[PDB]
Every structure is written in structure tokens, then in C-alpha cells.
RNA sequence: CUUGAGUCUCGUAGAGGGGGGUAGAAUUCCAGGUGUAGCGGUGAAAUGCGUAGAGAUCUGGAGGAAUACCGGUGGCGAAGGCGGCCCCCUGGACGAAGACUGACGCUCAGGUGCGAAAGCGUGGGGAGCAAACAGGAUUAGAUACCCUGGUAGUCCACGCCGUAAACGAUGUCGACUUGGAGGUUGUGCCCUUGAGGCGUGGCUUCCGGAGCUAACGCGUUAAGUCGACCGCCUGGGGAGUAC
RNA sequence: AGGAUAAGUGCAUUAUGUUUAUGUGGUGAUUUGCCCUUCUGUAGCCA
């Protein structure tokens, strides 16, 4: 279904991992639920939160929803330069403009998240819902274009069409 | 100016005030800025209702033109008056005080729903044979 | 109800599944409760609403077939 | 079934003819058969044949009640029969049924019912 | 190649049957309605037909197979006539819509049809 | 309404004499003549708000035409506020 | 050939048969059931035009004696 | 200057306001005539009414709010607002030609002005319905439920802080952005001749694309892209009350 | 209703019906992640 980067040899970032119930009499919830981020270690979109009746199958759900079943906004090459905010899902993620690379810090299990994105060259706060299970947004909400690429040459990448077309 | 499609019907008793009410109103019109377009008697019908007891009425549509001052003065009288059981008149928008598709109906009221009587020459007498009289 | 005409020189019945002028057709719909003035216009007035649900039934037949959800 | 009434058989006023009326509502029936020029001949209602509740107002109780004026009017001796139906109230058509086996023939169903130009505001009652 | 244009011609005077209610995305291609009945533009749907039909052709020489899909209770036997070949595949009323993704389930049908199909 | 009689008197007497409608001191004029026609209907009973509503626009719009015209020509400015008895 | 705009006898059937009218019972009877009244507008077929008039042209006419109002002369 | 706005006659729709006019029917009532026992109420019922002749019904009068139906996703107003229909006065909108001025614009603290309803000061009106109050009926009780009587009220006119769930639960107006169609209306072109098609506006509404939303949903009358300026918010309970 | 010519035809408690008494509070077996297949399930392409 929904089409994502490239990536040669996949990672399964399980960042989190939760069961939950309703069980009673005929129909039921007895199922896991399992947390996957996706990426090839430098930089992917794809997140992914499933359920199934059991451990092994609550993880392959959570690893099929990045990869496929997922609303994304695209990316290039394993480094951030288009440093913007943005609002996915009422998860809101701000990043201004500043240098890349170096400077990298978030709490918690999120400096993992970051480096599977590629967004961990420019990163700033996070508001809205502050929760792991849907922060992770950061390379979706975050960059607002399709391609964000490492040659500072980009801000003319569009432009040698537009003048050749004058 | 405006266009006003008067019609109205009035108690047989009282049909012998109509001749002399509709010539007064004629004369203020042609005589201030407005017209006659066709002024039509209609002759003693056949009501669907008895109004102030008795079932049958006698019906005149004026088809007048007169501006805002007359039409004001003619009104108020109109209004006020006795001879009148009811009345209903349109506005400007969309008039037809000019030929209408009731043409073979009203022959049909003078022809067929008609009572023959002495108020009923003055029917006649209503916007055809006019002389000045009654209001 | 009945309505003025409908049937020619009565027998046992009087025929009254049959014909209607426009006695009440938008000003009752809730028996055993006080009237409005501005109410009725959204509350009562419902002929056109339910005419869309006997629209949709003569529809819904034929695309249950197509669909062989029939 | 029924309740008391005049008969079926002698002579009172000797009238050959009338016009009948149904007041019909949601809970009884009111049938009184008239003289044709404007004089009561006879009633019954639903309520007078016994009957009570919602069950009043069914086709059947406005049977009966048609039923048991209808005996009653041959004393003033009716042979031939006009009809008024005025209500919105159920069986407009199985009081028609019992006049006919009374033996009358039955000429015209003339609406006139009661409904006003809107008239008053209705009772409070309930809350839908 | 103007054999593209002679057909789309030799289709497109049936000038519709539906109503003159039509797709908003589609608006371009739309000629005004006559007497509450549709009626594409014909002139305007020549020029995208031939550039269609050249890439078909070019597509002739990467092909495997191809698999009409769209498949209907009205729309079969449009199908039927179109395949005219077993290089291109078809069914016959109705389809159910993917099998790309869920393709393990899809062979392991066609392996318990044509077990069974030999046994009867 | 605004009779075509009370507008002739109007047009011939303000701006030029033949069909100017549109300049400052002739607008002013027309609006006031609209006024009159309400203040005649005001002399029955005094819950004439829904008209009074559109008075206020009239009212509003005269005056803004009076603050051009100031800015502009003096002559039709004085002459006009008082020769019509305005801004009250 | 010929042709007629914004006036009667030509668009629809005609213009000038139940245009806004009421002082005539034959356009309001076209429209009106054995019972002397009214019926609806899946009933009557008129135009758009003949109907957002006919709704005042009923009422003026039954207030000027025309049609019969009441259930009493139905 | 018009590219923004403002204006004149012509043409078109409507329950906008204020004051005039006007018809008929039930309940209610009185009278006369006829005629006999229940009527009413309800899921069943008693309370109530009635043998002093009730109920129903014929004829005629009465009296006052209301005005069914066409009536509808309709239409009008400034949001709330406005319902028989018309006139008289008059506001506001909606089209179109001739002609006219030329940023006179946008927004709006302050501000004056303005009521759905009841409340309400004084006046008119009170036929029906109805808070209370009475009494039934309901029931582990019955103030709620459901009923009957029945008074103020409901109903009008002007007035008082315009109160609220004061509505698109969505500030104003304005520019820009794929449309399609219903209801319904000015008008250009066609045998106007199919509530019809095409040219071009109009309100009012369904549907849905780019986009927007947490979800429903919105989408050319935005909840899109925006623009100026104003109003207002910063967790709950307590409190929309207190001071 | 001009006309009842039972014409002008399109529905029937005018469909939106529902007194039917009630019973304190929190907690709970498909698992320590001390997590089986990711396998063309992404423009390259893999368990």
C-alpha cells in the first residue's frame, strides 16, 4: 500500500512493548501490543504501532504499519537541512534553524528514535501529546518537503528546471 | 407608475354603489400620471362560501396604474369602504393589469353564475356603463 | 379523511385508504404536546425528508443485485 | 355488545328518511342518526356498547355502536340514508358497514370534519 | 498513428445515458449537457488516446502478462472481448480487489483448486 | 421608497441637470430625500427598528461623503451641510 | 424562426397560464382534487415558477371567495 | 485612475419591521328545536362533568387568540429574529441596461440603537390550553411519571437591564482556490416550447477533489490559501456566583 | 367547489408509540519482552 525510502537491510527499532484486555464471555480483547520504529540506521521514515493474539505476531503487525499502512512525508539521504515545524496527528515537533550535525541531545529512549529518522542533525521541542508511542513523528511533521539532501546546492536543485524553463 | 390589479366583490344590496365608486377612481387616475388598462365588470357570481348570509356576490377587477401619492388616496378609501364584502389586490412585481387567461371565465360568470335582478343592470353599469353616483 | 369525493354511490365501505386533499401535512407529527411557532418549520415539516428514504429503498434493490450481495 | 334503546318496529314520528353523523376521536365514537330536515331519530357510541381503553377506538367498537343506533331508527321508520363523517379518530368505514346491514343504502360520504383554521395550542401532556 | 483516433471516435458516439451530473476531477473532458444527458467532449479525448496506446506498445517488449481488473457484474464482458489471448489474463463477473500483497494465501488456493479439479 | 418624482426635483436642482446621480453633493442629496420618506413613516408608533437599521447606514454614509467633500471643494462643502440642515 | 424572451405563452407549456394569478379558478383547479382543495406538488407537476406563486395564489384566492376554504363546502 | 466603493430610474422574490384591512372552522358559549345515558380519560383507571336531561345533533347568534393545508433541503431579516393573505408607510436583498461621482476604502476601543421566551410597568384581551392549588392514578414511595379541574399565564401595544443553548455551537468584511447538482430567481441565445439546454449572476442546500481535523466533519456561503483590525482564552472543583 | 359530471384520482390511530418501582465501593489467568522469520512488505534490495 503506502510506499517509503530506501534502505538496503532493515533494522527493527522496538522502542516500546504493552498487552491489553477486555476479556468476558464470546467476543473478546486478549491480544499484545508492540512498538516498532523502522529505518537502516542513519535515516528512514516509518512508524508503526500493531496488535495480534500473541508476541510474535503483535511485533510482525507493528513492523507491517511503518513499512506499509502509514501516512509519511518523504526524505533523502540519512541528514536533515530542512529544519521546520509542523502538526501530524495533533503531535507537533519545531525545529529552527541551526547547525547540523553536532549538538544532540533528548531524554529518555528519543535520542534512539532520532537516529533511525535522520533527524538527529537538527532537532528542537516537542508539544502536543508527550508520549513515546506517537513523538516518534519527528521526520514526518518535521520536514515538510519530499527530499531534504546534503549538497547546500538544493536551494538551486529546483531552480537549474525553473530557469531553463524561462 | 405601479401597477395595482384590483379585484374585489361586493354584496348584492349593495352592487348599485359600484358604478359611481369605480368612475371616481377613474378620473383621479387619468386625471394625476396613471391609466385605465381595461377595466372589466364581471357581472353577479356564485360565491364558494356565504358571506354575511346570501351565496351569491358581484365581482369587478379594475386593472389600474396610478403612482404612490394616488394609489395611497384610493387605497384608504378602498379600505374603508362598505359596499366592499372583500377584496384582493398584487403588487408591481409581475403585474397583469393587462390580458389575462381568465378571459373565458369571466364571460362564464356574466353568462351562466349570474342572478338577474335590478342591482344587476347596475352590474353592468360597473365598468362598462359608467355614471358617476355612490361610493 | 375519508375526503368530500372518492367513491361512486357508497356500499358496506366508505373508502377512506384511497384519497386526501392536504388535511394536516406539516403540522402534526407529536401527539400529547403544546405547539410552536418557529418549531414546526424543522420539527413537523418532514413530507421531502421522508420522500429521500422511499428514493433510496426503489435504489438500494437493484445494487444489491449488482453488488450479489443479493 | 349494546345497551337499551327505542325499537325496532313501531311508529313515532314516521319520517321515511334521514342523514347520519359520525363523531369520530382517538378514543370513542359518537354516531347519532338525524332527520333529514334536522332532528335527533337516535345514538349510540363504543363507550354505551361496553367498551374501554384503546379498545374504544378500534374498528370494531365503531361497529357496534353503528350497529345498535342503527336498530333503533326503524321505529321512526328510516328506509333510505345520507352520510356525514367528521373526525380523525379510527373506523370511518365500519360504521358505514353497519348501517348497510340495518338495510340502508348509502348515498354519499360527506367529509366535514371538525379540524379548526389551526385553532388553540394543544395540551402539554407528555414530553414527546 | 491515427488508427487510435478511429476507434476512440467509433466508441464515444454513444454520447452517454447517465444524467448531466458528472466527476468534478473529471471537468476538463466534459462537454455541456443536452437535454439533461452527458456528452463527453469527443475532439478533446483524441490527443490523450494516442499517447496511451503508443505506451502500450513500447510496454510489449518488459511484458510478462497482463490482469484486467475492475471486474464487475456490467463490466465482464468488456473484459471478455478485450483479452482475446492466455498471454493476458481475465475473469468473468465480479473480482476482489488486491492479491499483490497477500499472494502467500493467493497460490495456496490455486494449489487446493487444482488438486481438487483433478480428483473430480 | 424614493419616488422617480422626488428624485427629477433632486437631480435638477443638485449636481448638473441632466441624470447626474453620482457626485458627493448630489449623493448627500438623495440619501437626505430617503430620510424624509422614513421620518414621515416614524409619526406612527415607535417600534420601527428594522427600518431604523437601515436609516443608520444612510446616516453613516451621508457623513462620510461630507468628510470627502471638506477635504475637497469648500464651496459644495458649506453649502451643501447647510442648505440641507445635516449633521443632527 | 422566431423567438420570445421574459414574457408569456412560450418557455414550459406557457407563461402566461399560472404566471402569479389567483383572480382566475381554472390555473388554481388544474391543481385541485375532486374535494375542492390543494394537493401536493408531486401531484400537481407545476412548474417551479407556477408553485412559489401558487403558494401565495391559493390563499389569496380562497380569501377572495374563489375557491371554497372551509371543510363546510369542501 | 478604477481595479475598490457609493448612486439614480427599470425589472424580480419574500412570514423583515410599524399601522390599516379581511374570510372561515373546531373547542368554548347562549338560545330555540330534536332526542336518551353515559361523556371524558388511559398502557387500565379514578378524579372531573352529567338525569336540574349531559354527550351527540339541527338552525342562528356570540366571543377571542389562532390561521391548518400550498409548506419544502423553501423564503425574508443584522445574529438571535420573522408564518393566513393582502394594502398603506418603509427598510434590506436579488438581477440588468443607460448614466453618474472617482479610495469618498478596510477593520473597529469608545459608542448610540435594537428582545427568542417568559419575567415585566401601565393599558386592551383571556375561546382553548396551563404553573400553583385541589384531588385522583402510578409505586420499594410518588413532589418526578400519567390524568382531571383550575387561576395567573400563554395573546397584543409601547416600555426596562436585551437574557439565554444570543447557531454554521464557526468575528468582520474582502481578495484568491477543480466543480457538479437540488430548491428557486433577474437575464442573453435555441422550435424559449420537455419545472428543459447552453451564456452569466443570485441566495439556500446536498455531494465531494487539493487542503484542513483528534474524530465526526468542513471544502468555493471553508473548517482551504490569506489579508488587514477587533473581540477573547490560558487546568479542574468551588464560581458565571462573590466583591 | 363552475361542475360533485362521485371529475381535476395517489393512502387509513394524519404515521416521530413506550406510567411499566429499585439494590454502596475498588480489584480480576493468553505470560517476566528474561519479544520466532523481518522473508520485494519501500526508487536500490534482503533473512
Not at chain 1, 513492523?63 to 501530524?88: C, D, F, S, W, Y
Not at chain 1, 508527550?130 to 518537503?145: F, M, Q, S, W, Y
Not at chain 2, 365581482?59 to 366592499?84: G, K, S
Request: net charge positive; hydrophobic share 35%.
Amino acid at each position: 500500500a503506502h510506499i517509503e525510502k530506501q534502505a538496503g537491510e532493515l533494522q527493527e527499532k522496538l522502542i516500546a512493548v504493552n498487552r491489553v484486555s477486555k476479556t468476558v464471555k464470546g467476543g473478546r480483547i486478549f491480544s499484545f501490543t508492540a512498538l516498532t520504529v523502522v529505518g537502516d540506521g542513519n535515516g528512514r521514515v516509518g512508524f508503526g504501532y500493531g496488535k495480534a493474539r500473541e508476541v510474535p505476531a503483535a511485533i510482525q503487525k507493528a513492523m507491517e504499519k511503518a513499512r506499509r499502512n502509514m501516512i509519511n512525508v518523504a526524505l533523502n539521504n540519512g541528514t536533515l537541512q530542512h529544519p521546520v515545524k509542523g502538526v501530524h496527528t495533533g503531535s507537533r515537533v519545531f525545529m529552527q534553524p541551526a547547525s547540523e550535525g553536532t549538538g544532540i541531545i533528548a531524554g529518555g529512549a528519543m535520542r534512539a528514535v532520532l537516529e533511525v529518522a535522520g533527524v538527529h542533525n537538527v532537532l528542537a521541542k516537542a508539544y502536543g501529546s508527550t508520549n513515546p508511542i506517537n513523538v516518534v513523528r519527528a521526520t514526518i511533521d518535521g520536514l515538510e518537503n519530499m527530499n531534504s539532501p546534503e549538497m547546500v546546492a538544493a536551494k538551486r536543485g529546483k531552480s537549474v528546471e525553473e530557469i531553463l524553463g524561462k | 407608475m405601479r401597477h395595482y390589479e384590483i379585484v374585489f366583490m361586493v354584496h348584492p344590496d349593495q352592487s348599485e354603489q359600484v358604478p359611481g365608486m369605480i368612475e371616481r377612481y377613474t378620473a383621479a387616475i387619468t386625471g394625476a400620471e396613471g391609466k385605465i388598462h381595461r377595466l372589466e365588470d364581471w357581472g353577479r357570481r356564485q360565491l364558494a362560501y356565504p358571506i354575511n348570509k346570501l351565496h351569491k356576490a358581484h365581482y369587478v377587477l379594475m386593472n389600474v396604474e396610478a403612482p404612490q401619492e394616488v394609489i395611497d388616496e384610493l387605497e384608504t378609501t378602498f379600505r374603508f369602504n362598505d359596499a366592499v364584502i372583500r377584496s384582493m389586490v398584487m403588487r408591481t412585481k409581475h403585474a397583469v393589469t393587462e390580458a389575462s387567461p381568465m378571459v373565458k371565465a369571466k364571460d362564464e360568470r356574466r353568462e351562466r353564475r349570474d342572478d338577474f335582478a335590478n342591482e344587476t343592470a347596475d352590474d353592468a353599469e360597473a365598468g362598462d356603463s359608467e355614471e358617476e353616483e355612490e361610493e | 379523511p375519508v375526503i368530500k369525493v372518492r367513491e361512486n354511490e357508497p356500499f358496506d365501505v366508505a373508502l377512506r385508504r384511497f384519497k386526501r386533499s392536504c388535511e394536516k401535512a406539516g403540522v402534526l407529527a407529536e401527539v400529547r404536546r403544546r405547539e410552536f411557532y418557529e418549531k414546526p418549520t424543522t420539527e413537523r415539516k418532514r413530507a421531502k425528508a421522508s420522500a429521500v428514504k422511499r428514493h433510496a429503498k426503489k435504489l438500494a434493490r437493484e445494487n444489491a443485485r449488482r453488488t450479489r450481495l443479493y | 355488545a349494546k345497551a337499551p334503546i327505542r325499537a325496532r318496529k313501531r311508529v313515532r314520528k314516521q319520517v321515511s328518511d334521514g342523514v347520519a353523523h359520525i363523531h369520530a376521536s382517538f378514543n370513542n365514537t359518537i354516531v347519532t342518526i338525524t332527520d333529514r330536515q334536522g332532528n335527533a331519530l337516535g345514538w349510540a357510541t363504543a363507550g354505551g356498547s361496553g367498551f374501554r381503553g384503546s379498545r374504544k377506538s378500534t374498528p370494531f367498537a365503531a361497529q357496534v355502536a353503528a350497529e345498535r343506533c342503527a336498530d333503533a331508527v326503524k321505529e321512526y321508520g328510516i328506509k333510505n340514508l345520507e352520510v356525514m363523517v367528521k373526525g380523525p379518530g379510527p373506523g370511518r368505514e365500519s360504521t358505514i358497514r353497519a348501517l348497510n346491514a340495518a338495510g340502508f343504502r348509502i348515498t354519499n360520504i360527506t367529509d366535514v370534519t371538525p379540524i379548526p383554521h389551526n385553532g388553540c395550542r394543544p395540551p402539554k401532556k407528555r414530553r414527546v | 498513428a491515427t488508427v487510435s483516433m478511429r476507434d476512440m471516435l467509433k466508441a464515444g458516439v454513444h454520447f452517454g445515458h447517465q444524467t448531466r451530473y458528472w466527476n468534478p476531477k473529471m471537468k476538463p473532458f466534459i462537454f455541456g449537457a443536452r437535454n439533461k444527458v452527458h456528452i463527453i467532449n469527443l475532439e478533446k479525448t483524441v490527443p490523450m488516446f494516442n499517447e496511451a496506446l503508443a505506451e502500450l506498445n513500447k510496454i510489449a517488449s518488459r511484458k510478462g502478462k497482463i490482469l484486467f481488473v475492475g471486474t464487475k457484474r456490467a463490466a465482464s464482458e468488456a473484459v471478455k472481448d478485450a483479452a482475446l489471448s492466455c498471454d493476458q489474463f481475465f475473469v468473468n463477473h465480479r473480482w476482489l480487489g488486491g492479491m499483490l500483497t497477500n499472494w502467500k494465501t493467493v497460490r495456496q488456493s490455486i494449489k487446493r483448486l487444482k488438486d481438487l479439479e483433478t480428483q473430480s | 421608497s424614493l419616488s422617480t418624482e422626488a428624485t427629477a426635483k433632486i437631480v435638477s436642482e443638485f449636481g448638473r441637470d441632466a441624470n447626474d446621480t453620482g457626485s458627493t453633493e448630489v449623493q448627500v442629496a438623495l440619501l437626505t430625500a430617503q430620510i424624509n420618506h422614513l421620518q414621515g413613516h416614524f409619526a406612527e408608533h415607535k417600534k420601527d427598528h428594522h427600518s431604523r437599521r437601515g436609516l443608520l447606514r444612510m446616516v453613516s454614509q451621508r457623513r462620510k461623503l461630507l468628510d470627502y467633500l471638506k477635504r475637497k471643494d469648500v464651496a459644495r462643502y458649506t453649502r451643501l451641510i447647510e442648505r440641507l440642515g445635516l449633521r443632527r | 424562426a422566431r423567438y420570445f424572451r421574459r414574457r408569456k405563452f412560450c418557455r414550459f407549456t406557457a407563461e402566461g397560464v399560472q404566471e402569479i394569478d389567483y383572480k382566475d379558478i381554472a390555473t388554481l383547479k388544474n391543481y385541485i382534487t375532486e374535494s375542492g382543495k390543494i394537493v401536493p406538488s408531486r401531484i400537481t407537476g407545476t412548474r417551479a415558477k407556477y408553485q412559489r406563486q401558487l403558494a401565495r395564489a391559493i390563499k389569496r384566492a380562497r380569501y377572495l371567495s374563489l375557491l371554497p376554504y372551509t371543510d363546510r363546502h369542501q
